[PDB]
Amino acid sequence: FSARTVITPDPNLSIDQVGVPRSIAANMTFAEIVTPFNIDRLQELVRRGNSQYPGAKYIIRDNGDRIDLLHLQTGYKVERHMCDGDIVIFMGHRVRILPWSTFRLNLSVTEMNLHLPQSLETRAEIQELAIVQDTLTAVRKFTKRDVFLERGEVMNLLMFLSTWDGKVPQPAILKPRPLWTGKQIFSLIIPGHINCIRTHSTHPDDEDSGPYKHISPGDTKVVVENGELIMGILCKKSLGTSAGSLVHISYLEMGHDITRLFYSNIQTVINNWLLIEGHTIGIGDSIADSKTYQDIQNTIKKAKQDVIEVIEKAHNNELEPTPGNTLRQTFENQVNRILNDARDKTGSSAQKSLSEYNNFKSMVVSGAKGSKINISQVIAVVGQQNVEGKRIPFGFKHRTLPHFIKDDYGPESRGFVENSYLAGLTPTEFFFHAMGGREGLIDTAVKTAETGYIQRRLIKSMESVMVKYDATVRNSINQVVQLRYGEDGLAGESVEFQNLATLKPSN
């Protein structure tokens, strides 16, 4: 029915808007019926013809006859080339026409086909019923106290606020020069009157216990009052969807309809500011000072010496094994624990090495979901390579690779990569990492298929379960699964995490 095309990101588009090429838009048409207060525009489109894009293709009379592209009157169903404002589905999106030949979307929630419905009822119901690690770093850099914006920069950023009231706020600094702050700009971005408390990732626990607990010595816990950022640096937990975040609170307070506007304003303003401030990654972000490199090398050497001591003591095997496991399992567990804790300590030291200017730290402190291990591998140590939850097996006769000795249980063999990615991996370490990556690829390949099967089975299990009008949950055959949904008959998207404040305290 439609033409499929690869998706190319376009930040300038709205979150609910899709960029459609004019050729694909003219390829398939949307059917509309003539109305007394739209006859003029439909007449213009049918006069334009099929040769041009914003025209029409077929006309259906009241008798059902189809005419290809001339009088239009009430009851005539004419199919016209889709234009701006139309609704299409792949969730429904608003259509915007763009020059080139690729579909365009914003990547903020996480080759594909599209379809536009013909009747108005389904269009209305899809319309009424239907920031990924990229802007988080620039938001974190934008909310720094160091951010001071000149008058022209402030005006340029302000123009990209769709919800701007048009009143330029007084700058945080008036003399010697009028200097604003990124916090003020994001405060203008924040809609309504949202009050939020959310600790920063860097914020240590000792700040609250000791003094300065809300004067924020290290730009500590984020406080937002009256819908404007009073203080703090906005990391992922304070901005991404979570329990009691800025986006979550704003949504629950006054609507996804303007939470989408919040998303769009954040994206546009942040992109335009980063246009002049700039972000990059390079060699210098992995060249942590010689002190930290020497500390990492010393820790790795100490870990290797400890493993060697464990091996020599196991050769002397006094070493009473732990209960519930044999000698082999116990000593493999000990070696794995030593290697893992050494790797974690080296990674923590490498992360703490980045003081303020390293570009990796900007992603680490904000996007710490799964980037900590990658950064630790890049700078400090790749770490132990495991196969089937165990070290590298003796593929040869009691030997991992022909370059080692028989019955070698040292850190050098069995798949421990002493060097980081910057220093380069030795050929044995390279092969062991290849084995580990192959195992990871196999695991991901099986996991995706199994997860898809589980999802399909689960959605097929209870596809017919619905909440009835008597506030009861019943299946297709009309048996009451629950008298009240969730044992309280209340929706699950309007609830929040709270504390009783009377269960824990003593009498």
Binding site: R457, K460, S461, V465, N475, Q479, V481, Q482, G486, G492
Partner: peptide, 22 residues
Amino acid sequence: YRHLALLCDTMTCRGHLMAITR
């Protein structure tokens, strides 16, 4: 917890443990 409760009550309301339709 609402989703988990619904899933558990869906396949325990028959009076006996039932497997998924698959």
